[PDB]
Short mmCIF file of the C-alpha atoms (twelve columns), coordinates in Angstrom:
data_MODEL
# 
_entry.id   MODEL 
# 
loop_
_atom_site.group_PDB 
_atom_site.id 
_atom_site.type_symbol 
_atom_site.label_atom_id 
_atom_site.label_alt_id 
_atom_site.label_comp_id 
_atom_site.label_asym_id 
_atom_site.label_seq_id 
_atom_site.Cartn_x 
_atom_site.Cartn_y 
_atom_site.Cartn_z 
_atom_site.pdbx_PDB_model_num 
ATOM 1   C CA . UNK A 1   -14.300 3.619   -1.130  1 
ATOM 2   C CA . UNK A 2   -10.597 3.280   -1.525  1 
ATOM 3   C CA . UNK A 3   -8.583  0.662   0.799   1 
ATOM 4   C CA . UNK A 4   -5.806  2.344   2.446   1 
ATOM 5   C CA . UNK A 5   -2.416  0.864   3.332   1 
ATOM 6   C CA . UNK A 6   0.192   3.326   5.148   1 
ATOM 7   C CA . UNK A 7   3.670   2.208   6.142   1 
ATOM 8   C CA . UNK A 8   7.219   3.391   6.389   1 
ATOM 9   C CA . UNK A 9   7.102   2.827   2.301   1 
ATOM 10  C CA . UNK A 10  4.395   5.067   1.478   1 
ATOM 11  C CA . UNK A 11  0.468   5.265   1.070   1 
ATOM 12  C CA . UNK A 12  -1.282  2.867   -1.341  1 
ATOM 13  C CA . UNK A 13  -4.824  3.198   -2.248  1 
ATOM 14  C CA . UNK A 14  -6.612  0.438   -3.724  1 
ATOM 15  C CA . UNK A 15  -10.021 -0.507  -5.863  1 
ATOM 16  C CA . UNK A 16  -10.429 -3.899  -7.421  1 
ATOM 17  C CA . UNK A 17  -9.155  -2.314  -10.716 1 
ATOM 18  C CA . UNK A 18  -7.462  0.938   -9.664  1 
ATOM 19  C CA . UNK A 19  -4.396  1.805   -7.654  1 
ATOM 20  C CA . UNK A 20  -2.981  5.031   -6.293  1 
ATOM 21  C CA . UNK A 21  0.442   4.809   -4.785  1 
ATOM 22  C CA . UNK A 22  2.856   7.462   -3.274  1 
ATOM 23  C CA . UNK A 23  5.953   5.715   -2.541  1 
ATOM 24  C CA . UNK A 24  8.821   7.191   -0.352  1 
ATOM 25  C CA . UNK A 25  11.827  6.457   -2.607  1 
ATOM 26  C CA . UNK A 26  15.303  7.761   -3.183  1 
ATOM 27  C CA . UNK A 27  15.257  11.678  -3.077  1 
ATOM 28  C CA . UNK A 28  11.480  11.919  -2.025  1 
ATOM 29  C CA . UNK A 29  8.068   11.014  -3.140  1 
ATOM 30  C CA . UNK A 30  6.898   9.433   -6.435  1 
ATOM 31  C CA . UNK A 31  3.456   8.745   -7.544  1 
ATOM 32  C CA . UNK A 32  1.827   5.878   -9.634  1 
ATOM 33  C CA . UNK A 33  -1.774  5.913   -10.643 1 
ATOM 34  C CA . UNK A 34  -3.535  3.188   -12.658 1 
ATOM 35  C CA . UNK A 35  -7.253  2.485   -13.730 1 
ATOM 36  C CA . UNK A 36  -8.298  -0.282  -15.960 1 
ATOM 37  C CA . UNK A 37  -7.081  1.598   -19.155 1 
ATOM 38  C CA . UNK A 38  -4.268  3.726   -18.435 1 
ATOM 39  C CA . UNK A 39  -1.031  3.826   -16.008 1 
ATOM 40  C CA . UNK A 40  0.788   7.202   -15.110 1 
ATOM 41  C CA . UNK A 41  3.719   7.639   -13.166 1 
ATOM 42  C CA . UNK A 42  6.369   10.178  -11.930 1 
ATOM 43  C CA . UNK A 43  9.928   9.990   -13.322 1 
ATOM 44  C CA . UNK A 44  11.010  12.676  -10.742 1 
ATOM 45  C CA . UNK A 45  9.881   13.080  -7.046  1 
ATOM 46  C CA . UNK A 46  6.553   15.218  -6.982  1 
ATOM 47  C CA . UNK A 47  5.509   17.569  -4.178  1 
ATOM 48  C CA . UNK A 48  2.593   15.723  -2.364  1 
ATOM 49  C CA . UNK A 49  2.574   16.403  1.478   1 
ATOM 50  C CA . UNK A 50  1.735   14.117  4.039   1 
ATOM 51  C CA . UNK A 51  -1.149  16.314  5.051   1 
ATOM 52  C CA . UNK A 52  -2.853  15.784  1.455   1 
ATOM 53  C CA . UNK A 53  -2.072  12.022  1.761   1 
ATOM 54  C CA . UNK A 54  -3.659  12.093  5.359   1 
ATOM 55  C CA . UNK A 55  -6.570  14.026  3.918   1 
ATOM 56  C CA . UNK A 56  -7.241  11.454  1.160   1 
ATOM 57  C CA . UNK A 57  -6.895  8.740   3.820   1 
ATOM 58  C CA . UNK A 58  -9.689  10.485  5.821   1 
ATOM 59  C CA . UNK A 59  -12.106 11.806  3.278   1 
ATOM 60  C CA . UNK A 60  -11.538 9.398   0.332   1 
ATOM 61  C CA . UNK A 61  -11.013 12.038  -2.118  1 
ATOM 62  C CA . UNK A 62  -7.549  11.646  -3.980  1 
ATOM 63  C CA . UNK A 63  -5.168  14.739  -4.081  1 
ATOM 64  C CA . UNK A 64  -5.614  17.662  -6.842  1 
ATOM 65  C CA . UNK A 65  -2.508  16.055  -8.552  1 
ATOM 66  C CA . UNK A 66  -4.455  12.698  -8.963  1 
ATOM 67  C CA . UNK A 67  -7.848  14.144  -9.916  1 
ATOM 68  C CA . UNK A 68  -5.700  16.055  -12.800 1 
ATOM 69  C CA . UNK A 69  -4.312  12.908  -13.952 1 
ATOM 70  C CA . UNK A 70  -7.382  11.471  -14.138 1 
ATOM 71  C CA . UNK A 71  -8.724  14.169  -16.205 1 
ATOM 72  C CA . UNK A 72  -5.841  13.829  -18.593 1 
ATOM 73  C CA . UNK A 73  -3.858  16.931  -16.982 1 
ATOM 74  C CA . UNK A 74  -0.327  15.368  -16.489 1 
ATOM 75  C CA . UNK A 75  2.267   16.929  -14.807 1 
ATOM 76  C CA . UNK A 76  5.625   17.181  -16.280 1 
ATOM 77  C CA . UNK A 77  8.046   14.248  -16.036 1 
ATOM 78  C CA . UNK A 78  5.748   11.493  -16.084 1 
ATOM 79  C CA . UNK A 79  5.293   8.471   -18.152 1 
ATOM 80  C CA . UNK A 80  1.586   7.591   -19.264 1 
ATOM 81  C CA . UNK A 81  0.796   4.241   -20.941 1 
ATOM 82  C CA . UNK A 82  -2.070  2.481   -22.392 1 
ATOM 83  C CA . UNK A 83  -2.579  -0.797  -20.842 1 
ATOM 84  C CA . UNK A 84  -3.825  -4.171  -22.639 1 
ATOM 85  C CA . UNK A 85  -7.495  -5.506  -22.618 1 
ATOM 86  C CA . UNK A 86  -8.607  -7.538  -19.742 1 
ATOM 87  C CA . UNK A 87  -7.338  -10.967 -20.223 1 
ATOM 88  C CA . UNK A 88  -10.283 -12.733 -22.429 1 
ATOM 89  C CA . UNK A 89  -9.844  -16.013 -20.556 1 
ATOM 90  C CA . UNK A 90  -10.470 -14.360 -17.031 1 
ATOM 91  C CA . UNK A 91  -12.998 -11.775 -18.529 1 
ATOM 92  C CA . UNK A 92  -15.941 -13.736 -17.264 1 
ATOM 93  C CA . UNK A 93  -15.043 -14.059 -13.860 1 
ATOM 94  C CA . UNK A 94  -14.830 -10.198 -13.238 1 
ATOM 95  C CA . UNK A 95  -11.041 -9.987  -12.265 1 
ATOM 96  C CA . UNK A 96  -9.165  -7.571  -10.191 1 
ATOM 97  C CA . UNK A 97  -6.340  -5.586  -12.031 1 
ATOM 98  C CA . UNK A 98  -3.064  -4.060  -10.777 1 
ATOM 99  C CA . UNK A 99  0.057   -2.965  -12.224 1 
ATOM 100 C CA . UNK A 100 3.477   -3.291  -10.881 1 
ATOM 101 C CA . UNK A 101 6.327   -0.892  -12.081 1 
ATOM 102 C CA . UNK A 102 10.051  -0.327  -11.226 1 
ATOM 103 C CA . UNK A 103 9.292   1.168   -7.824  1 
ATOM 104 C CA . UNK A 104 8.937   -2.001  -6.617  1 
ATOM 105 C CA . UNK A 105 11.445  -3.929  -8.632  1 
ATOM 106 C CA . UNK A 106 9.454   -4.526  -11.759 1 
ATOM 107 C CA . UNK A 107 9.642   -3.921  -15.499 1 
ATOM 108 C CA . UNK A 108 5.916   -2.243  -16.009 1 
ATOM 109 C CA . UNK A 109 3.670   -5.269  -15.836 1 
ATOM 110 C CA . UNK A 110 -0.352  -5.499  -15.725 1 
ATOM 111 C CA . UNK A 111 -2.017  -8.383  -13.736 1 
ATOM 112 C CA . UNK A 112 -5.309  -9.617  -13.832 1 
ATOM 113 C CA . UNK A 113 -6.478  -11.810 -11.231 1 
ATOM 114 C CA . UNK A 114 -9.248  -13.791 -9.179  1 
ATOM 115 C CA . UNK A 115 -9.513  -16.068 -6.200  1 
ATOM 116 C CA . UNK A 116 -10.805 -19.589 -7.248  1 
ATOM 117 C CA . UNK A 117 -11.137 -22.806 -5.147  1 
ATOM 118 C CA . UNK A 118 -8.486  -21.408 -2.765  1 
ATOM 119 C CA . UNK A 119 -6.394  -20.592 -5.195  1 
ATOM 120 C CA . UNK A 120 -5.242  -17.221 -7.213  1 
ATOM 121 C CA . UNK A 121 -5.696  -17.346 -10.737 1 
ATOM 122 C CA . UNK A 122 -3.732  -14.749 -12.763 1 
ATOM 123 C CA . UNK A 123 -2.328  -13.622 -15.998 1 
ATOM 124 C CA . UNK A 124 0.527   -10.961 -15.972 1 
ATOM 125 C CA . UNK A 125 1.636   -9.477  -19.287 1 
ATOM 126 C CA . UNK A 126 4.314   -6.688  -19.916 1 
ATOM 127 C CA . UNK A 127 2.664   -3.449  -20.644 1 
ATOM 128 C CA . UNK A 128 5.146   -2.440  -23.433 1 
ATOM 129 C CA . UNK A 129 4.998   -5.844  -24.988 1 
ATOM 130 C CA . UNK A 130 1.825   -7.823  -24.179 1 
ATOM 131 C CA . UNK A 131 2.871   -10.779 -26.017 1 
ATOM 132 C CA . UNK A 132 5.197   -11.597 -23.207 1 
ATOM 133 C CA . UNK A 133 2.666   -13.235 -20.676 1 
ATOM 134 C CA . UNK A 134 2.617   -15.378 -17.748 1 
ATOM 135 C CA . UNK A 135 -0.245  -17.480 -16.665 1 
ATOM 136 C CA . UNK A 136 -0.370  -18.812 -13.246 1 
ATOM 137 C CA . UNK A 137 -2.479  -20.459 -10.713 1 
ATOM 138 C CA . UNK A 138 -1.595  -21.308 -7.126  1 
ATOM 139 C CA . UNK A 139 -1.629  -20.349 -3.413  1 
ATOM 140 C CA . UNK A 140 0.470   -17.117 -3.704  1 
ATOM 141 C CA . UNK A 141 -0.519  -13.259 -4.307  1 
ATOM 142 C CA . UNK A 142 -0.969  -12.097 -7.537  1 
ATOM 143 C CA . UNK A 143 2.588   -10.800 -7.786  1 
ATOM 144 C CA . UNK A 144 3.414   -14.026 -8.377  1 
ATOM 145 C CA . UNK A 145 2.694   -14.158 -11.838 1 
ATOM 146 C CA . UNK A 146 4.706   -11.001 -12.500 1 
ATOM 147 C CA . UNK A 147 7.966   -12.455 -10.730 1 
ATOM 148 C CA . UNK A 148 7.948   -15.447 -13.017 1 
ATOM 149 C CA . UNK A 149 7.727   -13.185 -15.545 1 
ATOM 150 C CA . UNK A 150 10.520  -10.945 -14.347 1 
ATOM 151 C CA . UNK A 151 12.792  -14.121 -13.856 1 
ATOM 152 C CA . UNK A 152 11.923  -15.904 -17.066 1 
ATOM 153 C CA . UNK A 153 10.241  -19.004 -15.294 1 
ATOM 154 C CA . UNK A 154 8.053   -21.350 -17.110 1 
ATOM 155 C CA . UNK A 155 4.027   -20.571 -16.679 1 
ATOM 156 C CA . UNK A 156 1.039   -22.387 -17.644 1 
ATOM 157 C CA . UNK A 157 -0.103  -22.946 -21.204 1 
ATOM 158 C CA . UNK A 158 -3.282  -21.485 -22.498 1 
ATOM 159 C CA . UNK A 159 -4.968  -24.929 -22.282 1 
ATOM 160 C CA . UNK A 160 -3.890  -25.708 -18.693 1 
ATOM 161 C CA . UNK A 161 -4.984  -22.064 -17.548 1 
ATOM 162 C CA . UNK A 162 -8.309  -22.259 -19.384 1 
ATOM 163 C CA . UNK A 163 -8.942  -25.652 -17.637 1 
ATOM 164 C CA . UNK A 164 -8.299  -23.959 -14.231 1 
ATOM 165 C CA . UNK A 165 -10.624 -21.316 -15.266 1 
ATOM 166 C CA . UNK A 166 -13.414 -23.449 -16.092 1 
ATOM 167 C CA . UNK A 167 -13.510 -24.892 -12.560 1 
ATOM 168 C CA . UNK A 168 -15.389 -21.842 -11.156 1 
# 
């Protein structure tokens, strides 16, 4: 089943490598969807009602708009972006994957992440320019790698990250 977070900010429905979010932002409700391979989100607000979001919360069935997006039937005014492969250095650990986008202050970013030894190991990449990468290991949330990427803060080298991966 999806986990559900409901707040004044919106509704977020999560699985290890999938997220459906409906965010209450300037002038209405915006949606974002991603799985392991595709990200889709709206450039204009969409009409998805609180009742449909509550029915998703209760039944676990996504709203019809999301089922159409999953089937490749995209609404007007949306962006569709292909995601980079799962980070090869983490692939053996079955990592989680989330995307963060402009709705929450990020240039569109994909993060692969695991918990190991009481620490988060995460690799964040810009979706449009996947060579821009931040490798992170620390006590914070997976979003830390995306923040360091946003702020041009130095991250771990390939070699240091792989050594941290070796210990689990």
